[PDB]
Amino acid sequence: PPLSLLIKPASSGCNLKCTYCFYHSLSDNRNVKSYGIMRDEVLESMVKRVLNEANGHCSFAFQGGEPTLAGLEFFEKLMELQRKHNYKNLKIYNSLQTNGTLIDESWAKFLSENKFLVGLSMDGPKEIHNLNRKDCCGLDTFSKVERAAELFKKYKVEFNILCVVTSNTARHVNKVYKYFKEKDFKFLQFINCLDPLYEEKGKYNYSLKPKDYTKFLKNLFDFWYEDFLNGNRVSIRYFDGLLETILLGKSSSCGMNGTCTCQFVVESDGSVYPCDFYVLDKWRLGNIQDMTMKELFETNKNHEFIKLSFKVHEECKKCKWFRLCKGGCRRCRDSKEDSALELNYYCQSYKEFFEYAFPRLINVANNIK
Amino acid sequence: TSPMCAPARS
Numbered sequence: 001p002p003l004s005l006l007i008k009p010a011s012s013g014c015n016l017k018c019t020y021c022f023y024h025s026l027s028d029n030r031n032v033k034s035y036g037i038m039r040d041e042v043l044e045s046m047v048k049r050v051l052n053e054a055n056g057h058c059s060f061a062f063q064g065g066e067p068t069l070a071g072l073e074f075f076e077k078l079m080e081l082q083r084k085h086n087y088k089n090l091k092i093y094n095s096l097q098t099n100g101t102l103i104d105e106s107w108a109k110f111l112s113e114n115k116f117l118v119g120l121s122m123d124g125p126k127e128i129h130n131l132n133r134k135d136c137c138g139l140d141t142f143s144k145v146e147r148a149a150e151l152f153k154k155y156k157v158e159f160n161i162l163c164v165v166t167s168n169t170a171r172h173v174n175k176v177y178k179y180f181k182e183k184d185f186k187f188l189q190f191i192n193c194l195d196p197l198y199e200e201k202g203k204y205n206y207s208l209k210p211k212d213y214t215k216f217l218k219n220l221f222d223f224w225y226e227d228f229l230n231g232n233r234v235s236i237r238y239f240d241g242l243l244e245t246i247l248l249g250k251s252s253s254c255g256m257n258g259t260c261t262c263q264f265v266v267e268s269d270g271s272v273y274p275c276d277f278y279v280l281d282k283w284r285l286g287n288i289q290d291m292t293m294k295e296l297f298e299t300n301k302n303h304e305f306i307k308l309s310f311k312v313h314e315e316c317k318k319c320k321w322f323r324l325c326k327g328g329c330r331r332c333r334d335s336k337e338d339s340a341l342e343l344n345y346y347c348q349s350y351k352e353f354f355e356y357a358f359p360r361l362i363n364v365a366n367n368i369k
Numbered sequence: 370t371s372p373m374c375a376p377a378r379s
């Protein structure tokens with residue numbers, strides 16, 4: 001009201017085996033629970049509840065897992081439900097985050113005609129991408145992802161690139177930025193690679209350490225700002241979010257406002273969680289078939305989840321960048337179960353990045369008003 | 370706001 005949901009229509013099921021992914025079962029030692037494909041009755045109950053209860057507008061985002069594994073027919077059905085049951089004539093936004101490997105002519109057409117905003121996961125040029133994003137047999141995926149982008153350009157699907165920043169990304173910002181430029185990808189989101197929740201940090205070859213992230217951010221900013229000066233505008237979600245915070249005092253990105261929200265993550269059995277990073281039994285709010293969205297929001301579990309994020313670290317209280325950074329995403333402060341949050345893992349990276357980039361960030365903000 | 374690992378604009 002408005003309502004935004006993050007739906008996993010094929011649960012944690014996926015066809016790849018990306019090395020850093022903790023959203024899909026990779027092996028005997030990294031298992032993730034799967035509820036299978038969302039049944040029609042759950043999808044129907046979910047869609048009608050959102051249309052009945054939202055005010056203003058609503059948004060349905062499909063992730064996972066690989067959501068195309070639910071099949072095109074599932075999304076056909078989704079659209080049919082939205083047409084028939086939107087009694088309030090709400091504006092509806094749909095979005096899909098995909099590995100792109102199963103995208104074909106049919107998918108591209110459908111996503112284009114139905115105005116989906118699509119996020120396509122691509123870590124950079126061939127070798128960088130393939131290093132971590134492998135298929136079930138350990139083989140390469142980059143060419144199949146390029147094929148999806150090609151189909152999206154052909155059918156005029158609106159899409160953003162989702163790129164995970166690993167230690168390797170930090171060593172090759174030039175290759176990554178230039179690759180995306182050459183492909184004319186104008187909307188980029190760079191996601192810090194997370195180690196698995198509550199594991200000791202920085203133990204994997206891909207692990208993004210704070211010194212790596214500092215190197216990544218400073219260099220990325222330079223390429224971006226050079227483009228800005230030359231009149232080539234590239235949207236980088238993190239920088240866009242800093243600009244919003246500078247001009248408006250708030251950001252449209254979760255994790256940049258200093259406190260958590262309820263993202264209404266819906267697993268394929270209809271179970272609901274407050275954040276994509278926290279699809280765990282201890283944060284299971286209830287089932288969307290049997291509770292109103294307000295009831296889910298008002299649960300003690302959701303209240304607790306959000307309130308834990310209100311704690312401000314002492315360093316943050318005296319930090320010059322507090323009103324810009326706000327302590328960052330709670331997931332990067334959450335070091336051990338049931339313990340109080342601590343200082344953001346990337347605190348040092350933010351400080352050093354701000355010292356490097358703030359003067360130019362202000363220049364951009366002044367120019368976009 | 371919008372989730373971290375999801376497509377978003379502006």
Ligand SMILES: C[S@@+](CC[C@H](N)C(=O)[O-])C[C@H]1O[C@@H](n2cnc3c(N)ncnc32)[C@H](O)[C@@H]1O
Nearest residue numbers: 020021023064065066098099121162193194374
């Ligand atoms: C979990 S995937 C689900 C949708 C789809 N399978 C895909 O890859 O785009 C959503 C996004 O999360 C990213 N992701 C996976 N593991 C991550 C990690 N350890 N840290 C940060 N982002 C990660 C993926 O690369 C992808 O961009």
Ligand code: SF4
Nearest residue numbers: 014016018021065099
């Ligand atoms: S394709 Fe997406 S869900 Fe599947 S393993 Fe890779 S990042 Fe995880």
Ligand code: SF4
Nearest residue numbers: 254255260275329331
């Ligand atoms: S953990 Fe981060 S992404 Fe999740 S709700 Fe909190 S701020 Fe948002």
Ligand code: SF4
Nearest residue numbers: 316319322325327347
């Ligand atoms: S830079 Fe560090 S100390 Fe400053 S607000 Fe961010 S997390 Fe807190």
Ligand SMILES: [Cl-]
Nearest residue numbers: 140141142143
């Ligand atoms: Cl390849």
Ligand SMILES: [Cl-]
Nearest residue numbers: 189190237238
């Ligand atoms: Cl970004």
